[PDB]
Design an enzyme around this catalytic site. Structure first.
Site, PDB file in Angstrom:
ATOM      1  N   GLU A  35       0.853  -1.190   0.000  1.00 45.85           N
ATOM      2  CA  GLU A  35       0.000   0.000   0.000  1.00 45.85           C
ATOM      3  C   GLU A  35       0.906   1.263   0.000  1.00 45.85           C
ATOM      4  O   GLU A  35       0.713   2.195  -0.784  1.00 45.85           O
ATOM      5  CB  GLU A  35      -0.948  -0.024   1.242  1.00 45.85           C
ATOM      6  CG  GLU A  35      -2.173  -0.931   1.148  1.00 45.85           C
ATOM      7  CD  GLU A  35      -3.180  -0.516   0.058  1.00 45.85           C
ATOM      8  OE1 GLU A  35      -3.039   0.595  -0.507  1.00 45.85           O
ATOM      9  OE2 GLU A  35      -4.082  -1.305  -0.278  1.00 45.85           O
ATOM     10  N   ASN A  46      -7.100   9.085  -5.719  1.00 44.42           N
ATOM     11  CA  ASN A  46      -7.857   8.035  -6.405  1.00 44.42           C
ATOM     12  C   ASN A  46      -8.545   8.640  -7.595  1.00 44.42           C
ATOM     13  O   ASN A  46      -8.749   9.850  -7.622  1.00 44.42           O
ATOM     14  CB  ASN A  46      -8.856   7.382  -5.452  1.00 44.42           C
ATOM     15  CG  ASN A  46      -8.176   6.676  -4.290  1.00 44.42           C
ATOM     16  OD1 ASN A  46      -7.249   5.865  -4.492  1.00 44.42           O
ATOM     17  ND2 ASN A  46      -8.640   6.977  -3.050  1.00 44.42           N
ATOM     18  N   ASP A  48     -11.581   8.698  -8.272  1.00 44.67           N
ATOM     19  CA  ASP A  48     -12.851   9.279  -7.856  1.00 44.67           C
ATOM     20  C   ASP A  48     -12.718  10.636  -7.172  1.00 44.67           C
ATOM     21  O   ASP A  48     -13.730  11.283  -6.856  1.00 44.67           O
ATOM     22  CB  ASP A  48     -13.617   8.278  -6.967  1.00 44.67           C
ATOM     23  CG  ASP A  48     -13.127   8.267  -5.531  1.00 44.67           C
ATOM     24  OD1 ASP A  48     -11.936   8.423  -5.293  1.00 44.67           O
ATOM     25  OD2 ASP A  48     -13.936   8.124  -4.619  1.00 44.67           O
ATOM     26  N   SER A  50     -10.985  11.069  -4.240  1.00 43.99           N
ATOM     27  CA  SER A  50     -10.565  10.869  -2.882  1.00 43.99           C
ATOM     28  C   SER A  50      -9.029  10.660  -2.907  1.00 43.99           C
ATOM     29  O   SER A  50      -8.359  10.575  -4.004  1.00 43.99           O
ATOM     30  CB  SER A  50     -11.309   9.694  -2.218  1.00 43.99           C
ATOM     31  OG  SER A  50     -11.041   8.473  -2.870  1.00 43.99           O
ATOM     32  N   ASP A  52      -5.830   8.468  -0.710  1.00 45.70           N
ATOM     33  CA  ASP A  52      -5.403   7.441   0.244  1.00 45.70           C
ATOM     34  C   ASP A  52      -4.240   7.972   1.107  1.00 45.70           C
ATOM     35  O   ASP A  52      -3.325   8.544   0.548  1.00 45.70           O
ATOM     36  CB  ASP A  52      -4.913   6.218  -0.531  1.00 45.70           C
ATOM     37  CG  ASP A  52      -6.046   5.308  -1.044  1.00 45.70           C
ATOM     38  OD1 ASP A  52      -7.266   5.487  -0.789  1.00 45.70           O
ATOM     39  OD2 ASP A  52      -5.665   4.327  -1.693  1.00 45.70           O
ATOM     40  N   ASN A  59      -8.601   5.789   2.986  1.00 45.48           N
ATOM     41  CA  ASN A  59      -9.244   6.554   1.917  1.00 45.48           C
ATOM     42  C   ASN A  59     -10.105   7.664   2.528  1.00 45.48           C
ATOM     43  O   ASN A  59     -10.763   7.439   3.549  1.00 45.48           O
ATOM     44  CB  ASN A  59     -10.118   5.548   1.141  1.00 45.48           C
ATOM     45  CG  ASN A  59     -10.569   6.029  -0.227  1.00 45.48           C
ATOM     46  OD1 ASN A  59     -10.814   7.184  -0.433  1.00 45.48           O
ATOM     47  ND2 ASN A  59     -10.756   5.096  -1.137  1.00 45.48           N
TER      48      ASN A  59
END
Ligand SMILES: [Au+]
Ligand SMILES: [Au+]
Ligand SMILES: [Au+]
EC number: 3.2.1.17
Length: 129
Positions: A35, A46, A48, A50, A52, A59
């Site tokens: 990650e 991301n 969308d 958002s 991380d 998120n």
């Protein structure tokens, strides 16, 4: 901070992640490796909108507020920047909540695709725990 493997294992262990919801420590270490490469400061946007945050890439769509993720929740009730501290307490405590929500560790795309079904105990090999 960029943790050492066994250094993170030890810290995750003391915060009670080893077999938390049935997930052995190696699962958590493996997920952090893929990650964040064990880096508490890692941030990734991301598609969308958002973002991380932190060593377990939590998120902003659901879990923390970063001030720029319209239409989203803050279920760990923390600013996302708290997830970037060299003290992993906030990431851990939020993750316990994530992993407890019914989808288990499948909420972490790196886990599902790179850790799940693998010999994850190898991530703790040689570590003093
Ligand atoms: Au800690
Ligand atoms: Au803790
Ligand atoms: Au995880």
């Amino acid at each position: 901070k960029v943790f050492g493997r066994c250094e993170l294992a030890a810290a995750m262990k003391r915060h009670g992640l080893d077999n938390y919801r049935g997930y052995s420590l190696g699962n958590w270490v493996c997920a952090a490796k893929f990650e964040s490469n064990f880096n508490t400061q890692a941030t990734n946007r991301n598609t969308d909108g958002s973002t991380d945050y932190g060593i377990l890439q939590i998120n902003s769509r659901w879990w923390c507020n970063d001030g720029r993720t319209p239409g989203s929740r803050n279920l760990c009730n923390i600013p996302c920047s708290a997830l970037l501290s060299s003290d992993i307490t906030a990431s851990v405590n939020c993750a316990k909540k994530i992993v407890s929500d019914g989808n288990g560790m499948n909420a972490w795309v790196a886990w599902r695709n790179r850790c799940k079904g693998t010999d994850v105990q190898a991530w703790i090999r040689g570590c003093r725990l």
